Amino acid sequence: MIQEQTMLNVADNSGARRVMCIKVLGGSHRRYAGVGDIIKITIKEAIPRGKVKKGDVLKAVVVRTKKGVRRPDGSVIRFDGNACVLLNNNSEQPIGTRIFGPVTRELRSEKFMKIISLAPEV
Amino acid sequence: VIKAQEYRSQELNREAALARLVAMIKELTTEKKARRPTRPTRASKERRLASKAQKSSVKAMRGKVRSGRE
Amino acid sequence: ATVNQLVRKPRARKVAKSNVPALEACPQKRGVCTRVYTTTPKKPNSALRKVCRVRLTNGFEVTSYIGGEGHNLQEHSVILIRGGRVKDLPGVRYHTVRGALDCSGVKDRKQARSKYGVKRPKA
Amino acid sequence: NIKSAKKRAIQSEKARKHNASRRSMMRTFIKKVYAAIEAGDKAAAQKAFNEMQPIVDRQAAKGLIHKNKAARHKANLTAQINKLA
RNA sequence: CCCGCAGAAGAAGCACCGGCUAACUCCGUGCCAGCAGCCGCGGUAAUACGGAGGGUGCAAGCGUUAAUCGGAAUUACUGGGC
RNA sequence: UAGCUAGUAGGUGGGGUAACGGCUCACCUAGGCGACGAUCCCUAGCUGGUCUGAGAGGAUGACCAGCCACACUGGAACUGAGACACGGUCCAGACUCCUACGGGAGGCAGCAGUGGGGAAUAUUGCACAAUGGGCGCAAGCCUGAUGCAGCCAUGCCGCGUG
Ligand SMILES: [Mg+2]
Ligand SMILES: [Mg+2]
Ligand SMILES: [Mg+2]
Ligand SMILES: [Mg+2]
Ligand SMILES: [Mg+2]
Ligand SMILES: [Mg+2]
Ligand SMILES: [Mg+2]
Ligand SMILES: [Mg+2]
Ligand SMILES: [Mg+2]
Ligand SMILES: [Mg+2]
Ligand SMILES: [Mg+2]
Ligand SMILES: [Mg+2]
Ligand SMILES: [Mg+2]
Ligand SMILES: [Mg+2]
Ligand SMILES: [Mg+2]
Ligand SMILES: [Mg+2]
Ligand SMILES: [Mg+2]
Ligand SMILES: [Mg+2]
C-alpha cells in the first residue's frame, strides 16, 4: 500500500537510494499502489555518481511492499520494506541494469520482463 | 495575471489593474538601444605608430656598432 | 651567509614555474577548438592575430595561436597544441601545430615547410 | 583452477584435516597438564606431563610443530610443575 | 663472411641567413598579411613578413615542442650580498 | 601542521614465536616521543646508477643489476623448508559470463594481442640449438625465462648515395 509521501527503497542500481511517491498513477482518486503498480516519484537521496540525480521526477514500479501480495490460494508474501525500480519517465524501461532483493510473480508482465530477468529471486 | 486591490472601489481597482498592465507591457517591450562597438581613435593609432618609430630609431642607435670601418 | 645560519635554515632553491601549464609536461596536447576568432595585439603591434579557444583532453581551456597565412579551423576542429607564447597576444601561451591532426598545412609555403606542416612540392 | 594446483588443493585439504586432528589432540594433552597444574596436584600434573611428553616429541618429529615449540612446552610445563609444590 | 656478375646505375633532405648567431640580394606586400626565443620587424626601396636566386649549418636526418642541468656567483659550502 | 601517545613507556609473571620483543594477556609503575621537528598533511618505491656540471652541487631512478611492495578490490588462513601464495584455498564486494533460476564460473601489473585512454610506444612469430630453471638415475619432458626473428630513424655508431 504505497501512497503519496511514502518513502521507498530503490531495488535497482540506477543511483537513487530513497525515493518518495508523489503520485499513484492510473485512475482518478486512486489511493494505493500495490506491487505491479507504476507511481510517480521524486528522488530524495542518491549516490554521487549515479545515473539519476537528487530531486529528479520520474516513474517507478513497486516491487516489494510491507503490506505484501496475496496469492489466489490465500497465501501472502510480505517484505520487510517497500522497494521500487526506477523507470524512464516516457517509456517505463528500467533505468538501472541490476536489481537487488527478490521480486514477485505479480511483476511477470510484458513491460517488466527486464525486471523479472534481472531479479535474483522470483 | 494582475491582482488590483489597492482600493475599496472596484472601479478604481479596475483602472489600476489596466494601468499596471500597460506599464508592465511598456517596460517589457521597450527595446534597449543597441551598442555599436567603438574603435581606437586614429590619433591613438598614430600615437602607437609614432612611439614605435621613435623606439625603432633609439634601438637602431643602441647596441652593436659593428662593421668597424676597420 | 653565516654557515651557522645556513645549518639552521638551508638555502632554498627557486622552484621554477611552467609557462605552459596546460601541456602538463607533455610535448603536445589534443584539443577541440571551442572557438576560433581574431585578436588585436598589444603594445606597439597592430594586427589581427588568428587564435582559437581550445578545450584540451586534460580539461584545460586555453588559448592557442594559429600560425601561418590562412587556416581551416572552426568551432569544432580537433587540433594539436604545442608550447610557445605569442609575446604580443595576452594570454596565448600555445601554438597550433599546422599539418597535424585535422589542422591543415599552409598553402604555397616553400620555406620552413616542416613548420606549418607543408609537404614537399613536386620539384 | 587451471593447473596441478587442483591436486595441491586436494592434498592441502587432506593434510589440513590430518594436521587439525593431530594439533587438537596435542594441545588437548597440553591442556590436561595445565588444568592439573592450576588445580594444584603436583602428582596429577606430573602424570599428565608424562602423558603429553611423547606426544609433543613425536609431533615435533612428524613436523606438525617445531622441536623448539615442543621443547618450549616441555620446559615451561616442567617449570610450573616444579614450582607447584 | 668471402667470391663472381652488371651497371653510376637503385639511394639528400631539413633548418637557418636583423643582432645575439655562420650565412644577402631581388621581387611582392604595405602597421595588412604575417614573423618572433629576447630585443624587435611590417604604415611603398623590409638583408626581420611571403617567394626566388645566392649562401650558412647539420645531414638520413633536420627542425619544433616538452623536460632536466648548465650558463645563473640568479640561494653564493666551494661562491653573493644588506 | 606544536604538541602527540594509553599497550601507550617500562617492570613482573603467564601465554605465544624458529627466534628476541607489548608479540599478546593480567597486574604494577606513570611513563614514552617532540623544536636535533614529534604528530599531522602532501608527494614518493629505494639503491647501484643516469643526466648535467670544472668541481661542489642540482635533477633524476627509463633500460640493466640488488632490495622492497603488490597480483580484480578488501580480509583470512591452509599446505608447506619456505607463502599469508600472479596463472592455489576460503569469505565478502564490484564487474563479466553460464543457468534448467536451484545454482555456478572468472581475474593478462606473465608473453603476444584487443578495446579504451593518450602527443606517444611493437608480433595474437620461431626454438628450446646456447645458457639457465623444474622434475627425472638417466634418456627425456616442460620452460612467452632465455636465445633469436618481426615492427619502429627512438637513440648511438659505421658506411653509402660515386
Ligand atoms: Mg615464557
Ligand atoms: Mg653574422
Ligand atoms: Mg629555445
Ligand atoms: Mg620591397
Ligand atoms: Mg624574409
Ligand atoms: Mg648554481
Ligand atoms: Mg647580489
Ligand atoms: Mg614483558
Ligand atoms: Mg615535522
Ligand atoms: Mg605512487
Ligand atoms: Mg658552474
Ligand atoms: Mg586490471
Ligand atoms: Mg605451517
Ligand atoms: Mg602460485
Ligand atoms: Mg594472470
Ligand atoms: Mg586514442
Ligand atoms: Mg632449453
Ligand atoms: Mg606447456
Automatic annotation (TrEMBL), chain B:
Reaction(s) catalysed by this chain's protein: an N-acyl-L-alpha-aminoacyl-tRNA + H2O = an N-acyl-L-amino acid + a tRNA + H(+)
The alphabetical list of record keywords is:
Cytoplasm, Hydrolase, Translation regulation
Return the EC number. 3.1.1.29
Predominant location of this chain? cytoplasm
Biased-composition ranges, Basic residues, are 61-70
Where does this polypeptide localize? Cytoplasm
Could you say which enzyme class this protein belongs to?
Answer: hydrolase
The answer to whether the entry has keyword Hydrolase is: yes
Task: Extract the GO molecular function terms from the UniProt entry.
Answer: peptidyl-tRNA hydrolase activity; ribosome binding; translation release factor activity
List GO BP terms, alphabetically. regulation of translation; rescue of stalled ribosome
Q: Which family does it belong to?
A: Belongs to the prokaryotic/mitochondrial release factor family.
Subunit field text: Associated with 70S ribosomes and polysomes.
Name listed for the protein in its UniProt record? Peptidyl-tRNA hydrolase ArfB
TrEMBL record, chain D:
State the Gene Ontology BP annotations: ribosomal small subunit assembly; translation
Q: What does this protein do?
A: Binds directly to 16S ribosomal RNA.
Cite the Gene3D superfamilies for this sequence. Ribosomal protein S20
Note the Pfam families from the entry: Ribosomal_S20p
From which source organism is this entry?
A: Escherichia coli
**Which PANTHER family does the entry link to?**
30S RIBOSOMAL PROTEIN S20, SMALL RIBOSOMAL SUBUNIT PROTEIN BS20C
Give one GO term, molecular function aspect: small ribosomal subunit rRNA binding
Taxonomy, top ranks, is: Bacteria, Pseudomonadati, Pseudomonadota, Gammaproteobacteria, Enterobacterales
| Keywords per UniProt | Ribonucleoprotein, Ribosomal protein, RNA-binding, rRNA-binding
Residue segments, region Disordered: 1-24
Q: Which family does it belong to?
A: Belongs to the bacterial ribosomal protein bS20 family.
What NCBIfam families is this protein classified in? S20
**Classification via InterPro entries:** Ribosomal_bS20, Ribosomal_bS20_sf
Listed name of the protein: Small ribosomal subunit protein bS20
* GO CC terms: cytosolic small ribosomal subunit
Superkingdom as given in the UniProt entry: Bacteria
